[PDB]
Amino acid sequence: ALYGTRTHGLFKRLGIPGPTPLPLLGNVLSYRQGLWKFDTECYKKYGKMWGTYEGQLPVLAITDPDVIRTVLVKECYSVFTNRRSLGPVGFMKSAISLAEDEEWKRIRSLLSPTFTSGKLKEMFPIIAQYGDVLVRNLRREAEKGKPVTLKDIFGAYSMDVITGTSFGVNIDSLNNPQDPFVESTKKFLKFGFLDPLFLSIILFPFLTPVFEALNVSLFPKDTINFLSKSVNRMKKSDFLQLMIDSQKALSDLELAAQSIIFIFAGYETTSSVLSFTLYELATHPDVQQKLQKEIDAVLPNKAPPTYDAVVQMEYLDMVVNETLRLFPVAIRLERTCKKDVEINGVFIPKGSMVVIPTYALHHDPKYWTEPEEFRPERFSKKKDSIDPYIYTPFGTGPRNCIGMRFALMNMKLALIRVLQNFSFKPCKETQIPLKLDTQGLLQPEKPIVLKVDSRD
Ligand code: HEM
Ligand SMILES: CCCCCCCCCCCCOCCOCCOCCOCCOCCOCCOCCOCCOCCO
Ligand SMILES: Clc1ccccc1C(c1ccccc1)(c1ccccc1)n1ccnc1
Ligand SMILES: Clc1ccccc1C(c1ccccc1)(c1ccccc1)n1ccnc1
Ligand SMILES: Clc1ccccc1C(c1ccccc1)(c1ccccc1)n1ccnc1
Numbered sequence: 001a002l003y004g005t006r007t008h009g010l011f012k013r014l015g016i017p018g019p020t021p022l023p024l025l026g027n028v029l030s031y032r033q034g035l036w037k038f039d040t041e042c043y044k045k046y047g048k049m050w051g052t053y054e055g056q057l058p059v060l061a062i063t064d065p066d067v068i069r070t071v072l073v074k075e076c077y078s079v080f081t082n083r084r085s086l087g088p089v090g091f092m093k094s095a096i097s098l099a100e101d102e103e104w105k106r107i108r109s110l111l112s113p114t115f116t117s118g119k120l121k122e123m124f125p126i127i128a129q130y131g132d133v134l135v136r137n138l139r140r141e142a143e144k145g146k147p148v149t150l151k152d153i154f155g156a157y158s159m160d161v162i163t164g165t166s167f168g169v170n171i172d173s174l175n176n177p178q179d180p181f182v183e184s185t186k187k188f189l190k191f192g193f194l195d196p197l198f199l200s201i202i203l204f205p206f207l208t209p210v211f212e213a214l215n216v217s218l219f220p221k222d223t224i225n226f227l228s229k230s231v232n233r234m235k236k237s238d239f240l241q242l243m244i245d246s247q248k249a250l251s252d253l254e255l256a257a258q259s260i261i262f263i264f265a266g267y268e269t270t271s272s273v274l275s276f277t278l279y280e281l282a283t284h285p286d287v288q289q290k291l292q293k294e295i296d297a298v299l300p301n302k303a304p305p306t307y308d309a310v311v312q313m314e315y316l317d318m319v320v321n322e323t324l325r326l327f328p329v330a331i332r333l334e335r336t337c338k339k340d341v342e343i344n345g346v347f348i349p350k351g352s353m354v355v356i357p358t359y360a361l362h363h364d365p366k367y368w369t370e371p372e373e374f375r376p377e378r379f380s381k382k383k384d385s386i387d388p389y390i391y392t393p394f395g396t397g398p399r400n401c402i403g404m405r406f407a408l409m410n411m412k413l414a415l416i417r418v419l420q421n422f423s424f425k426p427c428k429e430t431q432i433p434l435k436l437d438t439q440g441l442l443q444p445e446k447p448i449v450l451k452v453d454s455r456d
Pocket of ligand 1: 261393
């Protein structure tokens with residue numbers, strides 16, 4: 001059984017500290033507390049650089065901004081181009097989040113004109129039309145005299161926007177739970193929990209070819225089929241339309257992968273940050289009232305938002321940027337060495353992983369005074385510019401979040417509407433302080449519920 005004790009002497013030899021890996025498992029057992037908790041604990045114990053093992057895969061965490069800049073920007077195309085080892089994914093191998101090396105550079109180049117600020121300005125009325133249904137669905141829950149579970153309200157809004165901006169179909173997620181789009185896309189929420197299949201190829205990466213050969217995918221095969229068949233039937237009759245017009249050619253299999261992955265990526269994360277932003281505005285009433293004072297001063301008498309009004313709301317941008325500091329839903333940034341590389345005078349083998357602990361650097365007292373406190377004033381345009389390698393909620397470099405500007409616009413349009421019409425405050429069922437759960441996509445331990453009062 002030559003598999004278990006092959007690489008577990010690397011960091012010990014290189015002089016890089018870290019937790020003691022168990023045979024076969026590595027340090028994988030330490031993840032059960034959540035990657036956010038494991039990363040902060042390692043940061044406090046070892047410092048600038050530590051080393052863990054996902055099975056037999058060596059993982060080197062780095063916290064020096066000069067080193068982060070080299071891995072995310074300088075040597076991106078040359079060493080650290082790909083994110084994590086390929087797993088059994090089927091045709092989703094052409095998804096932009098999975099594509100590697102030259103194939104990723106090509107797919108990223110084709111999709112880049114779709115997510116420019118110019119195309120976002122053209123789609124602004126499309127995104128904004130989903131604010132009405134959000135305010136309406138939130139109005140009835142407010143007049144019921146009962147608390148509002150934010151994940152159901154903004155989860156439905158996030159699915160509505162991401163599907164409407166992808167296919168042009170105006171789903172009413174909250175009022176049509178039995179819709180096939182809603183039930184299929186709902187299964188994406190299981191992402192973030194324990195995945196034995198994903199963990200099996202982590203500990204035994206040689207199983208990835210076997211699973212592919214047996215047509216086993218890390219994605220919900222039923223949901224991937226519904227979306228792929230839905231994408232095809234629509235092409236006979238938008239993110240989809242922008243990708244059809246672009247047809248270096250984007251194949252039919254590749255385009256179906258990008259449509260699916262954009263829905264997968266935008267659904268829960270947008271829903272999660274939107275709930276975190278409202279929790280902070282409720283537990284900080286003066287922060288909420290000041291933000292309401294800004295929206296009303298720019299948009300008088302509940303005026304419909306325009307692009308220029310949304311972009312020129314500074315205090316709205318500060319609140320969102322601070323919610324993302326406290327809760328970067330993608331806890332960390334990961335990269336793979338496509339060759340033997342020397343990082344900060346340390347020789348790292350090919351295929352090893354480099355983790356930028358975003359969450360740990362976001363709560364570091366060395367960079368943020370009172371790091372556990374929601375202070376939007378950190379992102380005031382008068383202070384010194386925040387380090388782009390310490391604050392990395394969307395990552396940095398050629399391979400950062402391609403939908404960063406879209407997600408920020410999608411959330412702000414929602415925040416402006418709900419604040420134009422409602423105020424938010426806690427109640428007996430609200431957890432203070434907020435306890436994060438162990439899920440790999442940041443979620444609270446108990447669902448956020450807030451009292452929603454209309455301003456009229
Ligand atoms: C506020 C919500 C969001 C957060 C916090 C977020 C966060 C991230 C992060 C941290 C990465 C990794 C970047 C890196 O490795 O440096 C990423 C990648 C990505 N995100 Fe997002 N994201 C969000 C919303 C979205 C939305 C709405 C979309 C879809 C339009 C999206 C699509 C992607 C894709 C496709 C990638 C992979 C980029 C690539 O590998 O080329 N994300 N996101
Ligand atoms: C032929 C060879 C086959 C090889 C099979 C390999 C199987 C590997 C199994 C080892 C698992 C090791 O687990 C440690 C790593 O876990 C880290 C991530 O998990 C953190 C959260 O869960 C902690 C896991 O350990 C405690 C058990 O808790 C499980 C809770 O799962 C989430 C609960 O939610 C219910 C399930 O999800 C539905 C969500 O709607
Ligand atoms: Cl599909 C995949 C293959 C290899 C590594 C990571 C992923 C990942 C995923 C998605 C669904 C189920 C299991 C793994 C993944 C899992 C955790 C963190 C990042 C990526 N993925 C999501 C988008 N593109 C790839
Ligand atoms: Cl276990 C693991 C290792 C490396 C990357 C991601 C994961 C992940 C996870 C989830 C919750 C707490 C710790 C790690 C994970 C993180 C984000 C999204 C999906 C899975 N996981 C893989 C299989 N089961 C769980
Ligand atoms: Cl892009 C993507 C698609 C499908 C599932 C997950 C993700 C991803 C993510 C988010 C939170 C926790 C783990 C992975 C992700 C996939 C791959 C690499 C980084 C992040 N993501 C959603 C939005 N922006 C990025």
